[PDB]
Design an enzyme around this catalytic site. Structure first.
Site, PDB file in Angstrom:
ATOM      1  CG  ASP A 254     -10.440   5.205   2.674  1.00 49.93           C
ATOM      2  OD1 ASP A 254     -10.508   4.158   3.346  1.00 49.93           O
ATOM      3  OD2 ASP A 254     -10.588   5.197   1.431  1.00 49.93           O
TER       4      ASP A 254
ATOM      5  CG  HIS B 234      -9.062  -3.181   7.070  1.00 48.13           C
ATOM      6  ND1 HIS B 234      -9.034  -2.051   7.856  1.00 48.13           N
ATOM      7  CD2 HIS B 234      -8.307  -2.897   5.978  1.00 48.13           C
ATOM      8  CE1 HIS B 234      -8.278  -1.135   7.273  1.00 48.13           C
ATOM      9  NE2 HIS B 234      -7.799  -1.628   6.144  1.00 48.13           N
TER      10      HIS B 234
ATOM     11  NE  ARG C 261       2.234   8.224   0.861  1.00 47.05           N
ATOM     12  CZ  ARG C 261       1.735   8.826   1.938  1.00 47.05           C
ATOM     13  NH1 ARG C 261       2.442   9.702   2.644  1.00 47.05           N
ATOM     14  NH2 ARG C 261       0.494   8.526   2.306  1.00 47.05           N
TER      15      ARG C 261
ATOM     16  CB  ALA D 128      -0.932   0.051   1.206  1.00 46.50           C
TER      17      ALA D 128
ATOM     18  CE  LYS E 160      -4.821   5.531  10.172  1.00 45.35           C
ATOM     19  NZ  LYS E 160      -3.407   5.516   9.654  1.00 45.35           N
TER      20      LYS E 160
END
Ligand SMILES: NC(=O)c1ccc[n+]([C@@H]2O[C@H](COP(=O)([O-])OP(=O)(O)OC[C@H]3O[C@@H](n4cnc5c(N)ncnc54)[C@H](OP(=O)(O)O)[C@@H]3O)[C@@H](O)[C@H]2O)c1
Ligand SMILES: Cc1cn([C@H]2C[C@H](O)[C@@H](COP(=O)(O)OP(=O)(O)Oc3ccccc3)O2)c(=O)[nH]c1=O
Ligand SMILES: [Cl-]
Ligand SMILES: [Cl-]
Ligand code: NA
EC number: 1.1.1.384
Length: 316
Positions: free
Chosen positions: A166, A77, A16, A11, A95
């Site tokens: 999100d 998830h 990052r 992802a 999250k």
């Protein structure tokens, strides 16, 4: 013996934030990274180490994985957290942990039966700046708190779970962090783009039972904002870059009261490193904080209450 971490899903957040944290953290060793495409995993492993793995079940099968990081899209998830826990792996899930409260309770029950840690990776909670703000508020810098606002909005980018799941999750989580456990839904609007059928933005109003309100704004059709603000009986406090401060960035707390304003510069911290560290320390020690799961469950309920109670508007 560092805990050996496997990543399911190559992802953007992994590349990052989470993976540079894992790679640097002495307590965690990246042992495997899995992707739907081997080549993407291999690119990630070339960057962060570990074995590249094709597909997620193969990673869950590994004896050299103790914990699995799950930065999949929100809707996936629950399936993959459930499988990782059944394979005996502790899980750091991004999250929102999952898509509703009943599902979150099922996942914690599975982890519980196995003595495993399941943690929602709200890395921003690990940044010291919020406790410094809350201690200022507690010392009375703006009197009694009357209301709270928080906003996380970003410009449209090139599916996803929508702006509520999100992104709106952040301001909602800050509201619970600062206002406490009895927040109740009052009303909200969610704007859904008819074209792609997806929430692109919204605004929600919550309140405590004493009537301290929270106006939370979120969205992905917007200029960047990332802030929160308290209105008190004798002042106001606000701060920017509240959810995603760089590691090296020094927060600035703004206060305004009658005829006087002040700004305080706080120390910079790496919240990504600190969240990964907290996860690894909980795994290594066996001390799985009860507050984390209770907070995640409260969080899931308010996110549900917002999806469900919102006026849904479709445009144009
Ligand atoms: N990027 C961020 O900073 C950010 C911001 C806010 C929230 N989040 C949260 O972080 C999690 C991931 O967000 P992200 O923004 O990093 O998403 P992302 O870049 O799309 O990453 C999700 C990864 O999941 C995998 N995946 C498996 N099935 C998929 C499918 N059907 N469609 C798309 N991807 C699939 C893909 O990995 P493989 O192709 O390698 O299998 C994909 O790279 C979500 O829970 C999201 O709410 C992230
Ligand atoms: C500073 C900044 C960012 N972004 C864009 C860049 C990026 O598309 C988005 C968020 O950048 P960031 O708050 O740094 O959050 P992370 O990427 O760590 O995690 C999330 C990524 C996407 C959604 C939410 C969190 O806003 C801007 O458009 N302007 C800015 O000044
Ligand atoms: Cl976070
Ligand atoms: Cl500023
Ligand atoms: Na609704």
């Amino acid at each position: 013996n560092p805990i050996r971490v496997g990543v399911i899903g190559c992802a953007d957040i992994a590349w990052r934030r989470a993976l540079p944290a894992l790679e640097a953290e002495p307590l965690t060793e990246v042992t495997a990274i899995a992707s739907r495409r081997w080549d993407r995993a291999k690119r990630f492993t070339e960057r962060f180490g570990g074995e590249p793995v094709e597909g997620y079940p193969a990673l869950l099968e590994r004896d050299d994985v103790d914990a699995v990081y799950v930065p999949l899209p929100a809707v996936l998830h629950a399936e993959w957290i459930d499988r990782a826990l059944r394979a005996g792996k502790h899980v750091l899930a991004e999250k929102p942990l999952t898509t509703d409260r009943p599902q979150a309770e099922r996942l914690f029950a599975v982890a519980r039966e196995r003595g495993l840690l399941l943690m929602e990776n709200f890395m921003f909670l690990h940044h010291p700046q919020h406790r410094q703000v809350a201690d200022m508020l507690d010392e009375g810098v703006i009197g009694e708190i009357r209301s709270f606002a928080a906003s996380f909005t970003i410009p449209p980018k090139p599916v996803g779970g929508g702006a509520l799941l999100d992104i709106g999750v952040y301001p909602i989580r800050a509201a619970g962090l600062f206002l406490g456990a009895d927040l109740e839904f009052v009303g909200a609007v969610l704007r859904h783009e008819r074209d792609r059928d997806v929430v692109v933005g919204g605004n929600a109003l919550l309140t405590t039972r004493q009537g301290v309100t929270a106006q939370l704004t979120f969205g992905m059709e917007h200029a960047y904002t990332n802030n929160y603000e308290f209105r008190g009986s004798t002042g106001r406090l606000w701060m920017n870059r509240v959810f995603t401060p760089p590691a090296t960035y020094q927060p600035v707390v703004h206060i305004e009261r009658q005829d006087h304003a002040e700004q305080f510069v706080l120390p910079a911290h790496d919240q990504f490193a600190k969240s990964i560290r907290a996860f690894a320390q909980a795994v290594l020690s066996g001390e799985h904080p009860r507050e984390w799961s209770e907070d995640s469950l409260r969080q899931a309920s308010l996110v549900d209450a917002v999806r469900t109670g919102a006026r849904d508007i479709y445009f144009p």
